Symmetry: C2
Subunit: 337 residues, 2 copies
Amino acid sequence: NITYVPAQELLLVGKATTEGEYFHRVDTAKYRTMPPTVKKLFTNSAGLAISFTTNSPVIKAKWMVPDNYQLPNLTRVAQKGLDLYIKRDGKWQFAGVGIPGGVTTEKVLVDNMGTEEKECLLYLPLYDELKSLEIGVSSDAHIRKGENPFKEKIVVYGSSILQGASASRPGMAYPARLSRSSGYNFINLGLSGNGKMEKEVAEMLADIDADAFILDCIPNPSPKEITDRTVDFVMTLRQKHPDTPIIVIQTLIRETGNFNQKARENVKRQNEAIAEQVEVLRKKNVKNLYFIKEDQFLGTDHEGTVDGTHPNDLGFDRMLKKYKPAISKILKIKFKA
Amino acid sequence: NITYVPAQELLLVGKATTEGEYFHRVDTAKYRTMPPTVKKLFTNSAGLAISFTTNSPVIKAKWMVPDNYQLPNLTRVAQKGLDLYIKRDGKWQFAGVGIPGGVTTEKVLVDNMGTEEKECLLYLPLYDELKSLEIGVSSDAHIRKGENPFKEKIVVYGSSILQGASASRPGMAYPARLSRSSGYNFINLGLSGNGKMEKEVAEMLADIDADAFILDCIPNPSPKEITDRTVDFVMTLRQKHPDTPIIVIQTLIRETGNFNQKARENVKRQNEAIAEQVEVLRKKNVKNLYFIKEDQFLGTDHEGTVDGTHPNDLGFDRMLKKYKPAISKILKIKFKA
């Protein structure tokens, strides 16, 4: 005897605005001048989650994801699945996953939990569109809309790496890890293959009521694109946000460059190009602009990626150990030890 | 202009014997009394690799894997793909992956390398059968059969976790990581769902010219199966190997038990059951028998799995930090710092 409630009756967490389709990251009808593939990517629920409370001993989910191609460098869980965390001892802790099948999946996420009150956070798919989601509990349990677990809006814009390639499951995307560690809302606006600093995307970002912008968008654009686009991108943000801190992060050093000398040189050039445009911005006296240089983000053993580019969870763990102190200093956000 | 050589002309690394089909782990025609699903799993190339040398600036692979179902908690790369390492500065280092498609895949693994001599090690799929593999180099380069990179035969028997669920790519399975770190040949005889200490499987293991046996086979069997089977399993090994060290490892504490109290209790019982059978073996005065108790193998934050059971690369990293000092003490094998 399971009673299901639509996620629309609970609390959506991690979305920059309340606009557009419920499970989309951005209202792509409103922001229709963005590139078509960018708009498609913003239909993926990366970094979104549902907050609820229940005394049920079991939590099930019924969810629908279209039969889109499964990326070979991602688990199906990460792309199309769900990740459930439950608060215990003041910390969000792993409870279970929703292992996706086909278009409609119905799974037990966790059972045999007992019937104490539990605060829950269910992360949504990273690399696919969520068409529907219902949360199931025992018929004699209650399920109620949860509280917002995080504070503020820290907007993170960037590449496939940011979106979550190749975290093993949805809650392991790096902004989700940063949010749980700090209690601040790191919003995932990563765009696989497509974080190339288009002015129309800057225009959308500038409309967000952000407390900070983190621009981790160096992996995708060419050096020429970085040279041509960075200043206009940052100036578009500053038009609407004269003071909001902007943090620019260099690209990680792709492991593809370990032996591929062409890839190595391209990464070097990307990082030089952004360093040069930061100097241009500094000469324009852009206020509250910060630049995080690459500093062994994936460690030193070359093991931190699935494919040379996209971190695995070990690579992300290493990256977070560098990102956290840098972000903490700039934004005055404490991360839990 | 690419010239291809079959892997059969190069050196196969990581196989316990030279018997049976080339890319199979075990000769399942010879060991036909093992369970059918065990035999099927031994057709998966987990822990096998090809050693070769080349001065090519490019390495390609053409490989065939049947259209078997992709496991949702594994990347396609891990299940059906390839992982290329190249020796540099006395260490095996990540060079590139073979991203699988359909049944036959032809991909560049790494290019733009330059034309110095390179010693290479290509890891084979973890969770699928490899039907054919050819390695491609520039037509004016040479490719030659490589040297054996490792010493001895350290046989590791166990579960899906051992076989490699959920390492991001083939070279990240834990025995492969142990081998690169030590220079010793940790042979992967993991069996997804099926490391249950059947006597017919012990009979096969006992025929291997092993330097040590590591039995990491507690996750799959029930407590009753552990109670009923452990002594006969170890005694079967000892019949043919009176002195070869045998190391029994407790199961990791599955993260499914973080909130699922039934799962929690089952793991507790599995670990109690094996501890009890170790005492039985000690009372039987079985020589050179070692027991590694669980010691926070996945860390303390509950983040180390893809699905509650199967480690991600972060979980494996943490496990190896415990396994290495324990194995080093017992087998007198040094792991590189």
